[PDB]
Amino acid sequence: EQKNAGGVGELEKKAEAGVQGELAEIKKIAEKKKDDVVKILIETVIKPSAEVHIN
């Protein structure tokens, strides 16, 4: 039981480190693609389309 408690305490930090690595990779990808995503979103918002709902 004591060994399991110590292992859980260490595995909490290990999982935190793994999640930190994954989050760092995700943040890097987001920083890479943010310019393109923002440009696409701005183009979509700033370029509306006329329509009529008769049909």
Binding site: K3, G7, A15, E22, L23, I29, A30, K33, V37
Partner: protein
């Protein structure tokens, strides 16, 4: 027989802790992506505010939004509620807005449109205009912030396919 209860206890009662830790890590992994998307949306909102700040570039966009709002309303009487700034641009180009509405829809051009005295909150709208029907009963919130929110709600799978490639698990 008595110790059989604790023989697997270190992996059964600590299984709850391990599962909770794994669930917390999995939820944090998704929350990181959500925070990244929120940052992207904040950058997009700042860029939209900056674009609206340029009146010369704003004017055609503003007329397009007004025309689309009228077509959605689809009535000859309409009331527009814009920001305190650029309230004169709508007054100046309503003559062309009416012609554009009458050309885009086969029906007759709008007889008259009134700029509402209830100016939109400049601290929040940061652009766009909310056109409303006569007696302000029916409205369309064609504001830049509202459009950004609607696009964020709707174009989420497109953003997914943009930042990340197609899901390898989704063979279909």
């Amino acid at each position: 027989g008595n110790f059989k209860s604790k023989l697997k206890k270190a992996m059964l009662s600590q299984q709850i802790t391990k599962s909770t830790i794994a669930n917390k890590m999995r939820l944090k992994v998704l929350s990181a992506r959500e925070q990244s998307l929120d940052g992207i949306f904040e950058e997009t909102k700042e860029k939209l505010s900056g674009i609206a700040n340029n009146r010369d570039e704003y004017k055609p966009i503003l007329q397009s939004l007004i025309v689309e709002a009228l077509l959605k309303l689809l009535e000859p009487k309409a009331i527009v509620k814009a920001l305190e700034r650029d309230v004169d641009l709508i007054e100046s180009m309503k003559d062309d807005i009416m012609r554009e509405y009458g050309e885009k829809a086969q029906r007759a051009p709008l007889e008259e449109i009134v700029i509402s005295n209830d100016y939109l909150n400049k601290d929040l709208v940061s652009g766009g205009v909310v056109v409303s029907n006569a007696s302000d009963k029916i409205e369309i919130n064609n504001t830049l912030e509202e459009r950004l929110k609607l696009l964020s709600e709707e174009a989420l799978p497109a953003i997914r396919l943009e930042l990340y490639g197609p899901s390898k698990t989704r063979k279909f």
